[PDB]
Amino acid sequence: LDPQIVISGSTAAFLAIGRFVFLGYQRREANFDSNSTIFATNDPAGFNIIDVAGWGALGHAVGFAVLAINSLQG
Amino acid sequence: DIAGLTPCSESKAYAKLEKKELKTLEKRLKQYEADSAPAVALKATMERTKARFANYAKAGLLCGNDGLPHLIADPGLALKYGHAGEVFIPTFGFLYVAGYIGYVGRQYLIAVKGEAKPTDKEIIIDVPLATKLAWQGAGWPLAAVQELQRGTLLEKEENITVSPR
Amino acid sequence: MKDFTTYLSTAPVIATIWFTFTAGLLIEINRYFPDPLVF
Amino acid sequence: PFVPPSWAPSVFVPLTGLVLPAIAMATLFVYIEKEAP
Amino acid sequence: ATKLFPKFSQGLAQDPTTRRIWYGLAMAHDFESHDGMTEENLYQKIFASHFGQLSIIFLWTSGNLFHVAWQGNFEQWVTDPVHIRPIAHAIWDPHFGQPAVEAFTRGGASGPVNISTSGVYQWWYTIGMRTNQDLYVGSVFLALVSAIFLFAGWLHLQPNFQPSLSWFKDAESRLNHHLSGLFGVSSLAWTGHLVHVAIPESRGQHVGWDNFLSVLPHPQGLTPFFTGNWAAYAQSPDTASHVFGTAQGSGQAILTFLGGFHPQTQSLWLTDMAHHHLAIAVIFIVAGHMYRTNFGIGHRMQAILEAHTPPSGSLGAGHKGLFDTVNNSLHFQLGLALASVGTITSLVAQHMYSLPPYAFQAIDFTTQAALYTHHQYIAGFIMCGAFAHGAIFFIRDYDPEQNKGNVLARMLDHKEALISHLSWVSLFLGFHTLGLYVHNDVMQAFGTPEKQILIEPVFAQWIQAAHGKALYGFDFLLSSKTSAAFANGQSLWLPGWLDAINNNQNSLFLTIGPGDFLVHHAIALGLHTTTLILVKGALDARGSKLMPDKKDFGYSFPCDGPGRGGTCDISAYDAFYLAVFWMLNTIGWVTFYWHWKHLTLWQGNVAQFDESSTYLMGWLRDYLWLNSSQLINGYNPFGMNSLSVWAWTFLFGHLIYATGFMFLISWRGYWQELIETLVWAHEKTPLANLVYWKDKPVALSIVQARLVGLAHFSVGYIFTYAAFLIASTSGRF
Amino acid sequence: AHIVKIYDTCIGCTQCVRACPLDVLEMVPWDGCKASQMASAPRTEDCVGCKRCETACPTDFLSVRVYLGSESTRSMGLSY
Amino acid sequence: EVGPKRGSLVKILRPESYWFNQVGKVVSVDQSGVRYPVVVRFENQNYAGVTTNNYALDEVVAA
Amino acid sequence: SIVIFHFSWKMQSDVWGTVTASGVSHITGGNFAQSANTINGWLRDFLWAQSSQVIQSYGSALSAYGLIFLGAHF
Ligand code: CLA
Ligand code: CLA
Ligand code: CLA
Ligand code: CLA
Ligand code: CLA
Ligand code: CLA
Ligand code: CLA
Ligand code: CLA
Ligand SMILES: CC1=C(/C=C/C(C)=C/C=C\C(C)=C\C=C\C=C(C)\C=C\C=C(C)\C=C\C2=C(C)CCCC2(C)C)C(C)(C)CCC1
Numbered sequence A: 001l002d003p004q005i006v007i008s009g010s011t012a013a014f015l016a017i018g019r020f021v022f023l024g025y026q027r028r029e030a031n032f033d034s035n036s037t038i039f040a041t042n043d044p045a046g047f048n049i050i051d052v053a054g055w056g057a058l059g060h061a062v063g064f065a066v067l068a069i070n071s072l073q074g
Numbered sequence B: 001d002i003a004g005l006t007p008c009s010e011s012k013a014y015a016k017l018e019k020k021e022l023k024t025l026e027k028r029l030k031q032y033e034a035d036s037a038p039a040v041a042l043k044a045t046m047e048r049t050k051a052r053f054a055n056y057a058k059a060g061l062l063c064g065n066d067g068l069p070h071l072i073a074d075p076g077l078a079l080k081y082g083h084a085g086e087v088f089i090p091t092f093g094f095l096y097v098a099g100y101i102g103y104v105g106r107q108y109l110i111a112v113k114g115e116a117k118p119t120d121k122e123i124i125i126d127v128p129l130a131t132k133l134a135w136q137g138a139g140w141p142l143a144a145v146q147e148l149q150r151g152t153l154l155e156k157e158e159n160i161t162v163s164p165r
Numbered sequence C: 001m002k003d004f005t006t007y008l009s010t011a012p013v014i015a016t017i018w019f020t021f022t023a024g025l026l027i028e029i030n031r032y033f034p035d036p037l038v039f
Numbered sequence D: 001p002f003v004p005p006s007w008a009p010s011v012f013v014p015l016t017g018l019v020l021p022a023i024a025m026a027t028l029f030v031y032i033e034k035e036a037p
Numbered sequence E: 001a002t003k004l005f006p007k008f009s010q011g012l013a014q015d016p017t018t019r020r021i022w023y024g025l026a027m028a029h030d031f032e033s034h035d036g037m038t039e040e041n042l043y044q045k046i047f048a049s050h051f052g053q054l055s056i057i058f059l060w061t062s063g064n065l066f067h068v069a070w071q072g073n074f075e076q077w078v079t080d081p082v083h084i085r086p087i088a089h090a091i092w093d094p095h096f097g098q099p100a101v102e103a104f105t106r107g108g109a110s111g112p113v114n115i116s117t118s119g120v121y122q123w124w125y126t127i128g129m130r131t132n133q134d135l136y137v138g139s140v141f142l143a144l145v146s147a148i149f150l151f152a153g154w155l156h157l158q159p160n161f162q163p164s165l166s167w168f169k170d171a172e173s174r175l176n177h178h179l180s181g182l183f184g185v186s187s188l189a190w191t192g193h194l195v196h197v198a199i200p201e202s203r204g205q206h207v208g209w210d211n212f213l214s215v216l217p218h219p220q221g222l223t224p225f226f227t228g229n230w231a232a233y234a235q236s237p238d239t240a241s242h243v244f245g246t247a248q249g250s251g252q253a254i255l256t257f258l259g260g261f262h263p264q265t266q267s268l269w270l271t272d273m274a275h276h277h278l279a280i281a282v283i284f285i286v287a288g289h290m291y292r293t294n295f296g297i298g299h300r301m302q303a304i305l306e307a308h309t310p311p312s313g314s315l316g317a318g319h320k321g322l323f324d325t326v327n328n329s330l331h332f333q334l335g336l337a338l339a340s341v342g343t344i345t346s347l348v349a350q351h352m353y354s355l356p357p358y359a360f361q362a363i364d365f366t367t368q369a370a371l372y373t374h375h376q377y378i379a380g381f382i383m384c385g386a387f388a389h390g391a392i393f394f395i396r397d398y399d400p401e402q403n404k405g406n407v408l409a410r411m412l413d414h415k416e417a418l419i420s421h422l423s424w425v426s427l428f429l430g431f432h433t434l435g436l437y438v439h440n441d442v443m444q445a446f447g448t449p450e451k452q453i454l455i456e457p458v459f460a461q462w463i464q465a466a467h468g469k470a471l472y473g474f475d476f477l478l479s480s481k482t483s484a485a486f487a488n489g490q491s492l493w494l495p496g497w498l499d500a501i502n503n504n505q506n507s508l509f510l511t512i513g514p515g516d517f518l519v520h521h522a523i524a525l526g527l528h529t530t531t532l533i534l535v536k537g538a539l540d541a542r543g544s545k546l547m548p549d550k551k552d553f554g555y556s557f558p559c560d561g562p563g564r565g566g567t568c569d570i571s572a573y574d575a576f577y578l579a580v581f582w583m584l585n586t587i588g589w590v591t592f593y594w595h596w597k598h599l600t601l602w603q604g605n606v607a608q609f610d611e612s613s614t615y616l617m618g619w620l621r622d623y624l625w626l627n628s629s630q631l632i633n634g635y636n637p638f639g640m641n642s643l644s645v646w647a648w649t650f651l652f653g654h655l656i657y658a659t660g661f662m663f664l665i666s667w668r669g670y671w672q673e674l675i676e677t678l679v680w681a682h683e684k685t686p687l688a689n690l691v692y693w694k695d696k697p698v699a700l701s702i703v704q705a706r707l708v709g710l711a712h713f714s715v716g717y718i719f720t721y722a723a724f725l726i727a728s729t730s731g732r733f
Numbered sequence F: 001a002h003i004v005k006i007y008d009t010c011i012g013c014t015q016c017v018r019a020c021p022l023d024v025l026e027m028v029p030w031d032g033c034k035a036s037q038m039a040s041a042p043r044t045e046d047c048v049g050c051k052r053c054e055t056a057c058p059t060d061f062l063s064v065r066v067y068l069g070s071e072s073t074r075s076m077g078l079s080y
Numbered sequence G: 001e002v003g004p005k006r007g008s009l010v011k012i013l014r015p016e017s018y019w020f021n022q023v024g025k026v027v028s029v030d031q032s033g034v035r036y037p038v039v040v041r042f043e044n045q046n047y048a049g050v051t052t053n054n055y056a057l058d059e060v061v062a063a
Numbered sequence H: 001s002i003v004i005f006h007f008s009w010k011m012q013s014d015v016w017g018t019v020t021a022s023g024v025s026h027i028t029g030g031n032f033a034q035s036a037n038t039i040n041g042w043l044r045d046f047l048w049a050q051s052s053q054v055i056q057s058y059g060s061a062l063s064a065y066g067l068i069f070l071g072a073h074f
């Protein structure tokens, strides 16, 4: 199994479901969840660097899990 | 069979234990005469031992590696392998007698509670009322279930004293 | 006799008679049914 | 190395058992009975 | 007049009696009760105390390492860890005569030394220590770390370094950093040590600070990790003929899940432990990103708590307001922490004896007995502390107006039902366990052992059969070969696990019978009764029908006087006091059971335990009387041996216990009158009245008496059992 | 010194004052009970904390309460 | 005339009282402006051996 | 209790015993003049050694004593 294809696909897929699917739900839950730093971005949907890092972390973890499971040959 | 145990009717340690008990009893019996009271008492004890071992092996009890019987407490195993007489039937028997005594005492307390001096009826037992309730307590599960369905078995929250929290 | 029956109806006398009856019943049961371990 | 000498227990055990407890006991006892101004 | 000590209480300082010293010593850590105490200062004092405790722990660890490297025989014990006894430290006692010097001279030493029972030798040998130089370096490093912690504790109290009150209440940040950093990064670092040092050292390759930067832990060198082919790391593991410490039969794998135990050391595989630490490190690191701190994403514990109320109204207001009543109450947090710590400690004791993690630890019987007993007693004390702090929370930090209708208020709403049901469970367990034991005792006394009641523990045996044990014959789950649960682990970990659980020579799920069933019921009785006393004392701490205003008297006070029939031991402190005895009794039963079962297993006769554990006479004669013959023979008119110290400790603990009985039975008044007579005698004696006291002599207070008696009781109990356990296990093996 | 407090439920029965063995309590005029008297504690510096007054109080709950405070020579009842 | 009738049965609502949520017979109601004019006598005594107490107008509910 | 313990040990050690040919043998062998000066001697030779009869009495005519020996500890 190609690691580059799996990692790239997993990261891009979870970033896509985070930007176009679960963005509104996450924003609505974060608002009701209620010294800090405001991360302003030019994204029209407010997809800042923090959300990118979180979704990319989830995508990389899932991609590496898939690669490991396929590496075990089971 | 169950939990690696063998029936007492086919256990070697069980028979060896019975032979050990009969051997020590016979050894103690050899020091007396034949028509004396201690000899008759020892022979009676030996007969009791033989009957006890025969009855335990006849009941189908499960013995361990020590030659002693074991009880089956699981309702499924007891009702599936013929061991309901160990712990199931005596459990329901105790439940009947326990609820019997509890219901008789509860009925006596509730009956003497509405009288002028209940403390006198508590230290000095009213034998006629207690005897009547003792004889009437045979239908305790039926009366208790009927009391529970009517809502009269329990007392309300507002009528019970509690701490100031 | 009323006072004597009232004295016999007290808690210790009733407890003594009841426990004697229960103990006697259990002893006689084990006497006529030696070594009952199961049903 | 960090290895202590052979005579180290013969000097540290009597110290920790008689020198240090006596000084500590005397100092603490004097401190407890100190009267406030 | 007013003395300088104590400085935190002017009322105690004005006390002109001996009660001032005792009370000042017993209330020094009660920071909330000092003079002029605020919340910020309170938290700062606790922060400094935490640093001081950490420094003490690290210095103690460094001292152990230093003594093992100096007076121990670690360099010789690693070559023969089966026939060589470990050495704790040397003995320099001028009171020892010639027989004591030659009696304690053992273990290949040149003088009198103590044989260790702590098991640090096996642990250090398993993690990678081989020479005394390693222990010396570790001791120096830990001493310097302890010094840094002490300096940090002093530095954080000075101005420009004291944390603010809001900093101490940052629950989200603190919990995220502890889950990701203190738990995940620490576990990841331990995985790195196991893969880089422990695993290569166990295969005969010395890897240290001088050569770890040039030695590869795996022949592929980090390539399978980056390429996602992690399955290559489990290739070529240690074979069944591997010798610990050498390269004979050693594999090249670093992360496996073979399961079971090592065939020689009878301990867990190092590769499996490293893999375990890596997996839990990944889980803890991921869990460290759950709460919102400063980047928008995350959660708020208050929102999760307030959003957990059932619609049916079964829990009332649910968990509303729980965030404020916990974050603002230090006793609640301490009680939760102590409860979790005690449970984890018990978990550690059970998992370490059943699943030995250190090499050549199962063969050391004394180490197993001492470690299990030590952890179980510590866990019992910690649990009692958790419940005590819960009672302290109810009296000092509970606010009914803020906690209105939530689960916390509903606990006090139906506390009578809880105490009543706990009483019923304890009564049922006590009556039945005692009745079955007395019945079995009478049957054994009358010569009819077949008439005793022996209930087979079918539930626990069924669980064991589910785990893979085929001795009972249930043949299901991991016991049946045609089950999916069995066939799904045959390629990962089930072979080694089944081979280790089916072996009756280890402590992995031992065979149980009627004696185990009965002693387990006794354990349940002890747990339920201890819980009953603690729970009742915590719920009745704010008041009951006898004392409707107990919350206004504090957590600890003597009584309410002899009025209302008597109010002896009415405070929550007294409930904890009575619960300590039940905790000691419960741990005594569990440790007695553990020691007897393992003694009969190590002696090769488990039938002795199986046949004598059903009647109390067997426990008193075959366990307490049979195993103390060598202990009490340590010193006699015919001479003495190395076991005389344990005999002296045995009698020492008995004396301390009996001394505690004095403070427990006799009460203050008699002693105060006696003291008054002694005061008159000293005041009217010539050549001696010139030396007058600075503190007026008075009898110990009621609370102080209870604490002193409890302390003597616990110390004597602990020392007596520890001496008997170590002496019996060491003499027998 | 110990803290002695009198609550408004005092019926002015004067039993707590008679039971006090060190002359701490007394009776003052009042308008909240039929007896028109109320217990007072103006000499708490001599109270030892025997709680005899609490035993002698007949109200439910008690009207006089004793809270153990700072111990001194008079509070510990020492003759030396 | 204010308060419960003499000889009636009332429930105690005072939480710190020993007879909280218990029935007691009314003895006498004081006609002055005292805080606790109702006198309630109970068959069961408290821990101090007392069977009578004084309660306020709102501290007792008819039951 | 200490009085009766001293009486029992002294009588069983230096007074009571069988009569053999040219010599008198006591129950415990006269160990009171050598083992009663220590607490360990009292606990081992008088309490641990002499309690063997009451703990193994089960199955004989003295078994009741053993039962009471346990009951009294309760
Ligand atoms: C007090 C707690 C308690 C405990 C710890 C157990 C424990 C056990 N029971 Mg059980 N049981 C209990 C109360 C309890 N029982 C009560 C109060 C009743 C009366 C209703 C029953 C009636 C009962 C029956 C009829 C059976 C068991 C059985 C079992 C054993 C396996 C089934 C199981 O774990 O699921 C829990 C048990 C139940 C929820 C009861 C229903 C039975 C389930 C559905 C299992 C049946 C499937 C099959 C027969 C399992 C056998 C597989 C293989 C060995 C052939 C197990 C050791 C089974 C057994 O081993 O047969 C000998 C069995 O058939 N029990
Ligand atoms: C009318 C008699 C009666 C009844 C119906 C109950 C019922 C109950 N008791 Mg109780 N109890 C009783 C008498 C009674 N008790 C007496 C006399 C005592 C003093 C020894 C106690 C002491 C007691 C304690 C300490 C506890 C209970 C508890 C309980 C509850 C749990 C069940 C249980 O079996 O506990 C156990 C029952 C006992 C230990 C005592 C049983 C004594 C006998 C068998 C009862 C009848 C005796 C009486 C002389 C006969 C009436 C004579 C009359 C016909 C002339 C239950 C509702 C538990 C609880 O708090 O509730 C959850 C609990 O902890 N009881
Ligand atoms: C907490 C850890 C600890 C413990 C329990 C012990 C225990 C012991 N040590 Mg050891 N020691 C330790 C740490 C420790 N040491 C360290 C880290 C060093 C390296 C500096 C040494 C160096 C050392 C030597 C050279 C010797 C001992 C010896 C001994 C034994 C004699 C008694 C004694 O105290 O001697 C003295 C102990 C010391 C000099 C260490 C004290 C230095 C630390 C930094 C002070 C700690 C302060 C403390 C925490 C404050 C509270 C304590 C108290 C005031 C309440 C005794 C069994 C002697 C021996 O072998 O007997 C046969 C001996 O010769 N120790
Ligand atoms: C914890 C540390 C500790 C240490 C290091 C010692 C050391 C010693 N003890 Mg001691 N002891 C201790 C604790 C200690 N004890 C405790 C806690 C108790 C109470 C249970 C006792 C009760 C005790 C008794 C009853 C006796 C000893 C005796 C002795 C001496 C053994 C005699 C011998 O064979 O050598 C040879 C003896 C000598 C070479 C003579 C040395 C003279 C002294 C000891 C040194 C010089 C005095 C010094 C200048 C002053 C130091 C005080 C200082 C704190 C200011 C020895 C030097 C015996 C003794 O005193 O000898 C007569 C003895 O009778 N001890
Ligand atoms: C990643 C950053 C980080 C790290 C590493 C730490 C680390 C630590 N903090 Mg800290 N903290 C942080 C961030 C961090 N904090 C932040 C950002 C805040 C502000 C919001 C705080 C606020 C804070 C406070 C208020 C306190 C601490 C405290 C502590 C110490 C806890 C002491 C302890 O329990 O031992 C270490 C605990 C563990 C290693 C976890 C053990 C897990 C279980 C219990 C054991 C299982 C392991 C294994 C099986 C056992 C090994 C066996 C064998 C080897 C013996 C600890 C050293 C306390 C302190 O200051 O002490 C001085 C404390 O009071 N911190
Ligand atoms: C993380 C653990 C922890 C922490 C931080 C605390 C913290 C606190 N506890 Mg606590 N507690 C704990 C665990 C803990 N506890 C445990 C495990 C128990 C069960 C044993 C208790 C039971 C407990 C009670 C009952 C009470 C407290 C109280 C207190 C508070 C102040 C009292 C104090 O500590 O003064 C200083 C502590 C002492 C001076 C200890 C007393 C001396 C002991 C008995 C030493 C004896 C050992 C002996 C000498 C061993 C040597 C033997 C050898 C020579 C042979 C304080 C906030 C008190 C309180 O809240 O005030 C109202 C209170 O009453 N605790
Ligand atoms: C061997 C000593 C001993 C024994 C037997 C007990 C027993 C008991 N304790 Mg206790 N405890 C002890 C020591 C002991 N404690 C000590 C030293 C302390 C520290 C002060 C405590 C502190 C303590 C507290 C704080 C509490 C208990 C509680 C209990 C009860 C728990 C319920 C139970 O298990 O039901 C089983 C019942 C029994 C074991 C009673 C024995 C049955 C007898 C032998 C049968 C009667 C014999 C025969 C029929 C008649 C003979 C009498 C004759 C004169 C005619 C129980 C009766 C808890 C409680 O009250 O529960 C509600 C409670 O809260 N204990
Ligand atoms: C084994 C436990 C124990 C012990 C040691 C004591 C000890 C004592 N009791 Mg006591 N008592 C006990 C149990 C015990 N009792 C119990 C359970 C109760 C409840 C019923 C009582 C009730 C009681 C009463 C009512 C009275 C006493 C009195 C006394 C004192 C009598 C004076 C004496 O004997 O001279 C000598 C002292 C001893 C023998 C105690 C041991 C001293 C050791 C052996 C010396 C060791 C010294 C050592 C070197 C110290 C160094 C320390 C080192 C760490 C630095 C004495 C201290 C009486 C009293 O007040 O005094 C007249 C008194 O009237 N007791
Ligand atoms: C008083 C108080 C308190 C409390 C305390 C406590 C609460 C204690 C306790 C206790 C405890 C100490 C507990 C514990 C517990 C545990 C649990 C609850 C568990 C569990 C389990 C499970 C769930 C499991 C499962 C399983 C199995 C079965 C096996 C295999 C695996 C698995 C997972 C599957 C506080 C302080 C808070 C405050 C307030 C007051």
Ligand code: SF4
Binding pocket: F006, F009, F010, F011, F012, F013, F014, F015, F016, F017, F038, F039, F056, F057, F058, F059, F062, F063, F064
């Ligand atoms: S005893 Fe109570 S009610 Fe009577 S006068 Fe004193 S404080 Fe008031």
Ligand SMILES: [Ca+2]
Binding pocket: E128, E130, E134, E201, E206, E207, E208
């Ligand atoms: Ca090395």
